[PDB]
Design a protein around this ligand. Structure first.
Ligand SMILES: Nc1ncnc2c1ncn2[C@@H]1O[C@H](COP(=O)(O)OP(=O)(O)O)[C@@H](O)[C@H]1O
Ligand SMILES: Nc1ncnc2c1ncn2[C@@H]1O[C@H](COP(=O)(O)OP(=O)(O)O)[C@@H](O)[C@H]1O
Ligand SMILES: Nc1ncnc2c1ncn2[C@@H]1O[C@H](COP(=O)(O)OP(=O)(O)O)[C@@H](O)[C@H]1O
Ligand SMILES: Nc1ncnc2c1ncn2[C@@H]1O[C@H](COP(=O)(O)OP(=O)(O)O)[C@@H](O)[C@H]1O
Ligand SMILES: Nc1ncnc2c1ncn2[C@@H]1O[C@H](COP(=O)(O)OP(=O)(O)O)[C@@H](O)[C@H]1O
Ligand SMILES: [Mg+2]
Ligand SMILES: [Mg+2]
Ligand SMILES: [Mg+2]
Ligand SMILES: [Mg+2]
Ligand SMILES: [Mg+2]
Lengths: 367, 367, 367, 367, 367
């Protein structure tokens, strides 16, 4: 009889019932067909592996992300993610609940429809409601105010919300992190001879992004001392035998997040987009948009931020302003801890769209 | 009514019904015509002895192998092998079954056609299927993963297979063992006065290859102490009166398998071809390609391997990697214990080519 | 007193003074040691033959390419290439000039250093400058705009340049042609029994790639009709007696350039990488990136391109766009006809690095 | 209507129909003219007596052997042998049968022709076939394998035959026994004063060779004790009055068969020629060429052999080899018991040469 | 003070100082003991005649070749060859020089040791070096390339050498000419009644091999017309009275060199061993291994070859290949004209083994 909060990101999909902790189930959200012909009977071999097995059996597959920079590529793969998940994982009936879905803040509609509809006719969840992914990130620390800087693979957003309404027109969306960070790392690792060309192997790059990373505080001056013999290099070992020693670029790569000329895209860094998004609000409210940046996603896990972000803003921000940049631990699940709280809470159950109200208007009314 | 798994190697041809133990019949696979004129009435004397009698009455024949380094030389002898076998040995009708054949992995087509076709019109087995000889060697201990090193007279192969699909391009085929090992032993036995010129007599060389052999662990250092008077020589006795004492070279000859400069061939040793075939796969998978080399054939019967193979690879292989080099006893019939399991197993019976489907395409479609 | 533009490719190394025609000297760039022991006094025999003689006396050597897939393997052989070239060929002093070198566009540094440095202290060329190999290929027909597709053994590149700046991030580098094309041809020639195992012998394969080749226009439909008896096969004659007749596969092998599944590599074909590199530029500029593909290298010598490339792009490219694929004759020397023009031209002479400026920084400043 | 197997030796010519026992007629094969003038009316006396009467009336003749050491001397006497035999003995018509003759294995051709032809035109036997004297000696006890040592006056042979073809080149023919043994005995009997100068009288010597003979086992040690007074001498009585007592040399003379220095011929003894013929065969076959020496002729009648031959061989033969020296009783007719079996047996009747096939080629085709 | 190049063949041993023409001394290389008892005081009679007197006084000896089919039988006779030669012929001191010896290419070691050592301790030549008999045959006409077919009694070899290193493994050694040709001629001369049993007399056979011999061009067809009465027979006269008339077989006997079935040996003729050795090299080099067969020895003195050899090869060789078969006059001393050039030439003097360097290693190091 439960209700299910299921967030589709380009993750790391998260699923777990209406509370109370963290997603019961998390997996990399990939389908990969076998790029070769199989010959050991059964037929045994699957037509396509979904996660998590499609992350355990790389190299013999071609990973294809069903979603990509917010808008998904095709629901043929997406629906299979879904069907696989509801039926053979959580062991939850389709008529169990009214569900709660998330999207990007400005994703081209109808990218919400085709989802809502296919999921509606196939899985027959008797209702529906979609809350934007940024808004939910506030329900983590349970604040009512603040500018939310939510960056996960592969779409970031900067949505300012006051108590308790939210300014719609003051939001700037950058197509930056994180596949561009993975790809940039893969492009600058070539500087030391390591070739990471194939689709499957790209995943390994992401892991060297995981452990071996830190954002400097004063890049321009730090680069000089990086050349000094003292190793700012840590050597990671790769799933086979190989031992790879990356340094210098280790702190260079994430820095791309600010100063994103390195990628060849003109929109200025998160540095500047935060401020320029804030002074797109009303002059009076700004006092409390500052000192309340609450970060989220899986791309605020770097040991660089937030005091990088801090010294960076304080140079651009007006003077005489106190700026706490409170960002929790556990942030990777922040959004989810949001959603859980919501559908269990009174009373927005009655701003849902049930079945009777999908026979009248249908594809519209969703917004 | 049974089905028959029959493998043609440069053996030692093996035949036995769809399971369950080992070939019912094994013989050296030779035809040899009598190099002399016969005068003992009847006419009595046969035009040519096939095995096994052609291995019991050597010296009065000129042994001619119907196949040689993978591709067969002529089907005139080959078909006669076949007809003789089916009709006067196994006592099996031609319409008894649909059959199962093996080939080399990269044998020049149409070396499979002329066989399939001649056997199709002559012996009329109402169906057909040819599985590659390396793949079958996994079905012995019933593993699903691994790089298979299958080396028999006279073509070796190195096929890496993951679970369960098989990488086609990571296979390197060396025309090495085993006639070159026989011929080389015959070339290095000459230094001690033993002349082994005649075709028939060469078989005897092969037998001294059998019993009197062992691969060292550290050749270069072992050779010094080999010169010491202490006999690492065992004296074998030859079918006539002669007593032959070979030492030193007894372990030198097989060593040719690595470091095949001794032959005057540039392709590097099995040592290097194993690794060089392995890192021709995808970087992530190698962890399990290692520690599962399953050897097969009749040339992995030396009491040297695998800790020779082991110590050698570990020097070329990356560090910190565990390498089991599991190779069964009973390996001589490994391939066959594979085949039996296959055609008896559901359900790939419907991946066959029967008679009705050889009326359409014919010489093609076999692959 | 002249200045020398010397480009190291995996060629076919090219050398000739600052203009005005084509390299004075071209040779296959190989060192090969004699795999055997020599016994006719002098000592006569060299420790290792460099080109061109190392291409006249194959079979008694083991050819070892000093560079391989962009990054060179070792400067021990490379330096000998150099020393041999400067001293005993062109008859040019080391202090004669400031020089001009090329590299790959994204070659792992320091693959440019060790060269620059060893060449700097050994040969003492009082200056230096290295222009990327793609950029020079535009100076042939003397265009200022276009996407350059430069594919030679053994690294291709796709660099888009506008007037007159060049987009750095829109370049995709495929490790495809040409040793993979040679090796693939050698791998599919085995299908008809021809064994091409030895290192030296591989060269002959390359020559059958030369004359006997052509890329089809509609492969999928062409393969059927290829089976028809009408010979699309031309019979080539081999340096010894043997006459080898390759057909069908004659056009199949080069086709690998597109669809590189045949090799077992996932990175999509040149077809798709050209386009995917182009629409990684800015949306407005694309109008002139199209209709100006200028091809180069020695692997765009097939009589297939460019209208194979054309029909292929027009299927992937947006509609209503005219796509010229201008690629000169003489392309094999295109790069060089570029370089010569450059160092003779004002004024980038003062963007050089002379000796006085290598006592300060050294290993840095080169980029 | 029967067929006749007739063997010409330097005997003791043997004749008897196609089976089934032994020759119907045996006689010493000599013609002898009367060396004196005859004067007792008739004129009565024959121009020349053939055997057997020419062996009843010695002393009044000059015995002249029609054949001598394989090659016959002249067919003028030989034909007279034949005509006399066929017409006035067996009482058989000339057109009765197709005939079967033997020769030496290596008798100088055409020593077979002049026979075949003369008998063909004179006696008109409508067909012909000539089988070699050695091969037939196997047909006695009906074995299929073995080295045959056939020594009769006056040409021995050593032919190795395997089952069932026969090695032609491994045969060594010594012009030794038996007229050389007779002549030697006559040469050493002078040692005790007995004069045997005349040709006729020589026959008597042969008889003292018959009864009074034995081959020692250890000559050298036996010779010492032979000198002891103990009579190893048996006293034979000669057709006239005289009583001759020979000892010592009685066993010395036959020993000449081995150690034939005594004659002044260097070619080593039958002892060594057996072995030296055997190891002129193939290395594999020797195992069964040994242990199957089947003797024949009339010079293997000595009570010394075969265990003399044995102790001699085992010292020369390789060790650990079992050597049967099987020699029947009745051996004197061995060859003939062969022929009977042959021409009576199907089916080699059609390997004959009849007359219709002798008008075409004639003197040729016989081989 | 000169140095001596001395070649031991089964000849015809040749000796003459370091250049410049031909051996000062040549003789048939035989020792022969007197098979009889001598009674003419002095003691007068020698214990054993070495050549040449042992070739002047046949018939009173038992000729025993000190070497036989490459490996020598015993150094007791060989040493006497040596001592006799150095001391009572060339009038040369033992310490005069460092010496140069030849061997077969694949003679069973240690067949070089026992020589090197005995000669070293007895004759005390302060150094040593042994070059293989085949290689020297190139130094005659002074070529650098080619496959050498060096056939003398009683071991032929086929050693292919490129410029300038030498392929070791492409050599096939046939135990053929010449004692097998002498013996074969003696075996087929019996066909016309001539008996040649004794060893001494065999020398005469060899002489009839000398003058009265010639190899046909198209044998099988030549035999038909050979039967025609027109004498292709030349009549030789024998040292006693006897006149011997040989025909037919006169050209048949040498023909045995190809098609050695006549002997009963399975290894195919020199015909095939030349080609089969050539295509045992690398594919590229063959172009110049052809058209450069330089023959040597004493068995290429037949007036048949080389256009026999030519027509034979061209039928087996691949088409469109030019095949010169250059073989000098004067060839009998070719090898020696080689040796002279060598030890006189710089600089391989320092690849010798002297006195000081034989106290350390001894029996080894010779190779
Ligand atoms: N510890 C970490 N350090 C750095 N980056 C991380 C870490 N954990 C996850 N990431 C990155 O965060 C991304 C996942 O973010 P996620 O919150 O799943 O975004 P979404 O919810 O939009 O899918 C991954 O692409 C990964 O590269
Ligand atoms: N105990 C042994 N030691 C070494 N080699 C052996 C042994 N037993 C057999 N062989 C060799 O193995 C070969 C048989 O291999 P096999 O597995 O039959 O190859 P295939 O199946 O391809 O014919 C024989 O030629 C023989 O020389
Ligand atoms: N006529 C031709 N057809 C096809 N390929 C060719 C032809 N001529 C040369 N090639 C190939 O082009 C390559 C030479 O390219 P090159 O311009 O030297 O590249 P790089 O300069 O990077 O070494 C050689 O590897 C050769 O295989
Ligand atoms: N008991 C015997 N002992 C020794 N020699 C004998 C004996 N009987 C016969 N011979 C010899 O054997 C010869 C006859 O043997 P035979 O088989 O006829 O020889 P061939 O077949 O060559 O004519 C006679 O010359 C005779 O001297
Ligand atoms: N003119 C000739 N014709 C045929 N054969 C010959 C001729 N001269 C010599 N021979 C044979 O060739 C042999 C000489 O070969 P040789 O070159 O001396 O070999 P090696 O030098 O190895 O002893 C002799 O034994 C002889 O029988
Ligand atoms: Mg998100
Ligand atoms: Mg096999
Ligand atoms: Mg290039
Ligand atoms: Mg006889
Ligand atoms: Mg010789």
């Amino acid at each position: 009889t439960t209700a299910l909060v299921c967030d589709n990101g380009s993750g790391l999909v998260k699923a777990g019932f209406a509370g109370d902790d963290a997603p019961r189930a998390v997996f990399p959200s990939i389908v990969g067909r076998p790029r070769h012909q199989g010959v050991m009977v059964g037929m045994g071999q699957k037509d396509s592996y979904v996660g998590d097995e499609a992350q355990s059996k790389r190299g013999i597959l071609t990973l294809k992300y069903p979603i990509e920079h917010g808008i998904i590529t095709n629901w043929d793969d997406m629906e299979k993610i879904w069907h696989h998940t509801f039926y053979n994982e959580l062991r939850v009936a389709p008529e169990e609940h009214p569900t709660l879905l998330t999207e990007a803040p400005l994703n081209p509609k109808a990218n919400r429809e085709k989802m809502t509809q296919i999921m509606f006719e196939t899985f027959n969840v008797p209702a529906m409601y979609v809350a934007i992914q940024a808004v939910l990130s506030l329900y983590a620390s349970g604040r009512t105010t603040g500018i939310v800087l939510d960056s996960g693979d592969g779409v970031t957003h900067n949505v300012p919300i006051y108590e308790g309404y939210a300014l719609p027109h003051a939001i700037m969306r950058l197509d930056l992190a994180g596949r561009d960070l993975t790809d940039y790392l893969m492009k600058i690792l070539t500087e030391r001879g390591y070739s990471f060309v194939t689709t499957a192997e790209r995943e390994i790059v992401r892991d060297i992004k995981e452990k071996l990373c830190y954002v400097a505080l004063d890049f321009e001056n730090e680069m000089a001392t990086a050349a000094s013999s003292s190793s700012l290099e840590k050597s990671y070992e790769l799933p086979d035998g190989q031992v790879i020693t990356i340094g210098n670029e280790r702190f260079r790569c994430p820095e791309t997040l600010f100063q994103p000329s390195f990628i060849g895209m003109e929109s200025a860094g998160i540095h500047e987009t935060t401020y320029n998004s804030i002074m797109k609000c009303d002059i009076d409210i700004r006092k409390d948009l500052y000192a309340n940046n609450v970060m989220s996603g899986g791309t605020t896990m770097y040991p660089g931020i937030a005091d990088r972000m801090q010294k960076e803003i304080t140079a651009l921000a007006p003077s005489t302003m106190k700026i706490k940049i409170i960002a929790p631990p556990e942030r990777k699940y922040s959004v989810w801890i949001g959603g859980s709280i919501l559908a269990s809470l009174s009373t927005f159950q009655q701003m849902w769209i049930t079945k009777q109200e999908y026979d009248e208007a249908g594809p519209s009314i969703v917004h």
